[PDB]
Amino acid sequence: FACKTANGTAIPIGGGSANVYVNLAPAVNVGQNLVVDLSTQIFCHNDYPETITDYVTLQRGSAYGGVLSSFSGTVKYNGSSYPFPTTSETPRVVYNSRTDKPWPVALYLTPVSSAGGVAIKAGSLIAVLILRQTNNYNSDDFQFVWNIYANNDVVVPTGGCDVSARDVTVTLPDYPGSVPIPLTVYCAKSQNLGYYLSGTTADAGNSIFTNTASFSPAQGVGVQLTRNGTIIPANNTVSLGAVGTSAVSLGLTANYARTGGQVTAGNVQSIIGVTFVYQ
Amino acid sequence: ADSTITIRGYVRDNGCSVAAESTNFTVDLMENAAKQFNNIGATTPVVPFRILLSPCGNAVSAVKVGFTGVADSHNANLLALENTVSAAAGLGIQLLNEQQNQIPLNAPSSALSWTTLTPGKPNTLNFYARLMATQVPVTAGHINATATFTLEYQ
Amino acid sequence: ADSTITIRGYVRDNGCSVAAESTNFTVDLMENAAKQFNNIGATTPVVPFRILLSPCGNAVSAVKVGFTGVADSHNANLLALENTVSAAAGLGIQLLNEQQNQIPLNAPSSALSWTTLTPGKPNTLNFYARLMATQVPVTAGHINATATFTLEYQ
Amino acid sequence: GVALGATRVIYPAGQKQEQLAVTNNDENSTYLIQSWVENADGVKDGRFIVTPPLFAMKGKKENTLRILDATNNQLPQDRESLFWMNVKAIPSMENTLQLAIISRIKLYYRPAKLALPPDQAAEKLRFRRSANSLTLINPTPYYLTVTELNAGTRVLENALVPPMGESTVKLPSDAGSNITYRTINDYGALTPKMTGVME
Amino acid sequence: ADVTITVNGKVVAKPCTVSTTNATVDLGDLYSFSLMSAGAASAWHDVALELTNCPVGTSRVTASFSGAADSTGYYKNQGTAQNIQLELQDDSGNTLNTGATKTVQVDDSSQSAHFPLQVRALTVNGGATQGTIQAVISITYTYS
Numbered sequence: 001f002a003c004k005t006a007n008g009t010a011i012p013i014g015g016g017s018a019n020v021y022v023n024l025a026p027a028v029n030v031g032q033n034l035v036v037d038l039s040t041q042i043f044c045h046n047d048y049p050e051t052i053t054d055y056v057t058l059q060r061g062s063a064y065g066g067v068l069s070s071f072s073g074t075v076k077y078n079g080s081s082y083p084f085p086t087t088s089e090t091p092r093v094v095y096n097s098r099t100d101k102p103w104p105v106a107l108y109l110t111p112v113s114s115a116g117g118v119a120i121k122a123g124s125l126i127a128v129l130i131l132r133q134t135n136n137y138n139s140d141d142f143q144f145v146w147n148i149y150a151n152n153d154v155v156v157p158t159g160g161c162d163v164s165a166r167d168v169t170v171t172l173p174d175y176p177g178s179v180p181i182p183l184t185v186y187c188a189k190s191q192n193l194g195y196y197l198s199g200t201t202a203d204a205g206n207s208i209f210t211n212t213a214s215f216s217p218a219q220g221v222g223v224q225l226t227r228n229g230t231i232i233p234a235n236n237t238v239s240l241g242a243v244g245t246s247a248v249s250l251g252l253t254a255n256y257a258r259t260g261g262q263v264t265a266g267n268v269q270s271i272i273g274v275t276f277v278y279q
Numbered sequence: 280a281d282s283t284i285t286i287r288g289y290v291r292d293n294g295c296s297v298a299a300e301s302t303n304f305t306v307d308l309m310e311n312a313a314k315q316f317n318n319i320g321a322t323t324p325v326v327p328f329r330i331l332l333s334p335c336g337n338a339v340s341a342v343k344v345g346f347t348g349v350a351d352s353h354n355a356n357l358l359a360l361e362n363t364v365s366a367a368a369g370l371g372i373q374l375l376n377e378q379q380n381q382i383p384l385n386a387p388s389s390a391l392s393w394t395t396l397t398p399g400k401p402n403t404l405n406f407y408a409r410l411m412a413t414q415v416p417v418t419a420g421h422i423n424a425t426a427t428f429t430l431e432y433q
Numbered sequence: 434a435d436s437t438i439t440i441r442g443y444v445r446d447n448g449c450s451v452a453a454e455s456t457n458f459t460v461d462l463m464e465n466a467a468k469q470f471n472n473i474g475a476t477t478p479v480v481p482f483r484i485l486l487s488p489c490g491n492a493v494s495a496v497k498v499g500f501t502g503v504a505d506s507h508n509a510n511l512l513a514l515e516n517t518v519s520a521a522a523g524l525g526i527q528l529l530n531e532q533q534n535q536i537p538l539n540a541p542s543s544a545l546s547w548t549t550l551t552p553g554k555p556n557t558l559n560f561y562a563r564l565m566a567t568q569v570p571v572t573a574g575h576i577n578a579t580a581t582f583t584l585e586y587q
Numbered sequence: 588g589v590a591l592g593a594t595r596v597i598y599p600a601g602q603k604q605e606q607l608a609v610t611n612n613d614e615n616s617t618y619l620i621q622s623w624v625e626n627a628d629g630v631k632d633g634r635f636i637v638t639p640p641l642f643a644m645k646g647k648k649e650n651t652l653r654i655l656d657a658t659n660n661q662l663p664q665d666r667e668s669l670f671w672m673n674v675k676a677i678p679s680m681e682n683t684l685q686l687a688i689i690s691r692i693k694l695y696y697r698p699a700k701l702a703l704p705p706d707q708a709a710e711k712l713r714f715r716r717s718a719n720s721l722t723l724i725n726p727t728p729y730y731l732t733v734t735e736l737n738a739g740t741r742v743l744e745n746a747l748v749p750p751m752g753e754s755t756v757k758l759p760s761d762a763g764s765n766i767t768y769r770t771i772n773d774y775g776a777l778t779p780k781m782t783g784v785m786e
Numbered sequence: 787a788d789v790t791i792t793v794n795g796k797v798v799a800k801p802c803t804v805s806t807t808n809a810t811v812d813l814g815d816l817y818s819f820s821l822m823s824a825g826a827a828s829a830w831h832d833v834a835l836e837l838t839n840c841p842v843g844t845s846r847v848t849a850s851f852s853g854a855a856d857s858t859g860y861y862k863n864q865g866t867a868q869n870i871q872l873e874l875q876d877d878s879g880n881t882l883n884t885g886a887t888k889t890v891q892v893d894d895s896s897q898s899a900h901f902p903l904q905v906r907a908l909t910v911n912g913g914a915t916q917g918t919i920q921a922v923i924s925i926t927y928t929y930s
Binding site: 113114115116117163165166167168169170171172173174175176181183198209218221223252254256258261262263264265266267268269270271272273274275276 | 787788789790791792793794795796797798799842843844845894930
């Protein structure tokens with residue numbers, strides 16, 4: 001039972017542990033969110049199939065690690081789904097051939113938000129998978145751990161919906177104009193969405209976000225967001241109604257708005273957070 | 280270029296030059312009998328002198344003519360005679376305007392009054408001079424005195 | 434060129450203003466006709482005349498007075514009458530002083546004496562004029578004449 | 588009535604002219620005024636011009652005669668010279684004697700650069716009492732017109748003492764004792780009384 | 787938050803409307819006897835430069851003064867009068883000779899700025915002679 005990654009790196013054999021670097025393509029699906037599909041990333045074969053047959057099982061205690069460690073979901077082992085973290089041993093897969101075949105595992109996550117996400121930077125831990133190996137010649141069995149490491153920056157979805165982008169820069173014209181914000185949202189299944197804004201605000205009505213510009217900042221001016229033609233204050237849920245698999249624009253447009261009196265010339269920057277909710 | 284201040288005006292000539300005649304001149308009081316000085320304040324007859332002004336500015340209106348010099352120690356309004364052995368004592372020279380009224384020696388601008396003038400034309404400033412008794416009896420002798428005149432224009 | 438007015442003149446103790454009264458004769462050929470009282474006729478009602486020294490400066494306390502004119506060919510001290518066809522003959526006008534003594538006609542300044550005057554005050558000098566025969570007989574005719582009085586100041 | 592401005596005239600050498608005023612105070616009179624200078628001997632020698640030499644005063648008027656030098660520096664430089672200024676008023680027109688008036692005043696020609704000034708000339712006069720007479724001595728270069736000459740209480744005659752010369756008057760011994768005198772200065776005024784110094 | 791929006795912008799100062807295109811000072815008639823001595827001057831004459839409708843963003847206007855000067859430094863008289871120059875000041879004792887600049891705050895309430903200036907004639911060396919007084923000070927503004 002010898003395995004290697006998609007990149008061609010041999011996974012060291014033994015009864016200890018091994019760090020296995022793989023590519024993730026997370027995704028929002030209906031009911032569960034795909035975290036990793038190891039069936040395209042890890043490939044295993046039997047060097048001496050004519051004399052011996054290997055069996056590999058996924059042990060209990062296999063779970064997410066690092067920043068994903070607080071989450072739970074399912075594991076799709078050899079066509080069928082089991083709870084994850086695993087609470088019991090899995091049926092075995094047989095390796096009886098020199099031909100490489102996928103390690104048929106795929107980790108999923110139970111949604112806990114609406115459009116939330118979690119950043120996994122490359123080089124860090126995703127999951128700890130306990131494997132047990134047995135053969136058809138003796139009754140020996142040994143265990144080893146595969147630590148699944150991401151080798152690409154990724155955002156694992158945490159809810160039922162996803163967004164066109166998680167960071168969006170927009171540039172206003174040089175006062176007193178406006179620019180439309182390109183930001184759309186879709187859900188794997190039809191949900192009742194709504195979003196609210198957040199950040200530092202200048203006014204009492206909490207509608208105009210303060211100018212945080214660092215170099216040569218203007219004065220008496222801040223940023224204020226609008227949809228259709230209405231001021232959207234912070235911590236005040238706008239409602240998109242019902243959103244399906246087809247993308248829907250939040251309909252936001254950035255504007256200048258006045259805070260203090262004398263409007264000095266200079267630069268204007270404002271960072272605004274958007275958080276999605278079910279209604 | 281986008282905005283512009285434009286300044287305007289004239290400098291007008293409101294004064295006159297003293298004519299060559301009058302730059303410096305003399306007044307002859309001639310002989311005066313001693314006996315006519317009956318008490319302090321007695322005065323001889325008036326002797327006319329004048330000051331000619333030419334050329335004159337087109338914006339001249341009036342002048343304040345004044346006379347300065349060493350005043351007499353017994354009357355400040357009179358011009359003192361030179362004190363030599365030969366000179367007459369007990370006297371002082373009085374100076375008068377065209378209407379024969381006193382023009383005090385060393386009088387400041389406020390005390391003096393204006394005299395009308397024709398603009399752009401030559402002007403003649405008429406005056407009178409005469410003696411006045413500060414003491415009696417008046418002692419006889421030479422009469423000698425100088426006095427600077429001054430013009431202040433309006 | 435600095436606007437100086439120089440003043441000169443004098444105060445002097447003055448002389449006298451002199452006015453001589455012209456003497457008049459009328460007679461009506463009186464004495465003349467009944468004259469021939471020798472060549473020493475020496476009589477007619479004397480006609481007086483004054484010479485007034487007034488006003489007078491405070492100086493004058495003495496003057497030298499004298500008469501001059503065309504003398505009589507017969508008598509040096511008689512003033513010759515006019516010689517015309519109208520005129521009389523055998524007569525020279527005699528000038529007599531205050532004390533009815535004859536005045537030396539045409540006398541020199543050494544001969545004359547000082548007449549004292551009162552300074553400041555007016556002064557009157559008194560004289561008389563009559564006719565004195567120089568030829569017997571006198572004849573009828575005009576008696577006009579002219580003489581010069583002379584005041585010499587000290 | 589005709590009057591002169593001065594009782595005498597000083598002519599300083601080098602002067603170009605001297606002035607003498609002539610005044611008629613009578614509104615009704617009209618005179619011919621004829622003026623000229625004579626020397627000490629009473630002769631018209633032409634050392635001085637008078638201008639105008641002849642003019643007519645009509646009524647209350649004043650006119651200033653002007654005496655001009657014509658000597659050309661041919662006079663004594665060491666002392667004063669005596670001339671006589673004459674102003675003759677002839678009334679311009681009955682068996683009448685009509686009079687003309689001559690006013691006659693001293694004209695002193697005064698050379699330049701005399702040591703003694705005029706004011707100090709009076710006090711230099713000295714006397715000489717002898718016989719029945721009194722000589723007056725004048726060491727100054729000025730003609731001294733001595734007046735009010737009192738031999739005690741006895742008032743003697745006036746005198747004109749020549750410059751650098753003498754002059755004698757009559758004197759009664761039957762008279763006062765101490766001498767006092769006065770002079771007529773350049774402007775016609777009397778100088779103060781001075782004590783008669785003898786010898 | 788689920789998404790972060792960064793909005794970038796800029797406030798640029800822009801030109802106002804200049805009301806006073808042609809300011810006119812008239813000193814009237816001055817008099818030689820008064821302008822005789824060195825440092826003699828006429829009475830000050832207030833002149834106002836007015837800029838209105840100042841766009842938001844523009845908080846200051848800077849005036850820049852130009853004109854033909856003479857050896858005294860002040861503005862040359864183009865008129866016939868001699869020994870006479872023109873002086874321009876603010877209202878704080880600062881001479882605005884050719885080349886100098888003055889800055890004022892834009893009044894936010896009125897959306898406009900004004901320069902309070904004063905002008906007089908003067909004679910540095912004295913002896914101001916008869917003649918006309920003519921001078922034109924050109925002025926342009928920058929905005930910030």
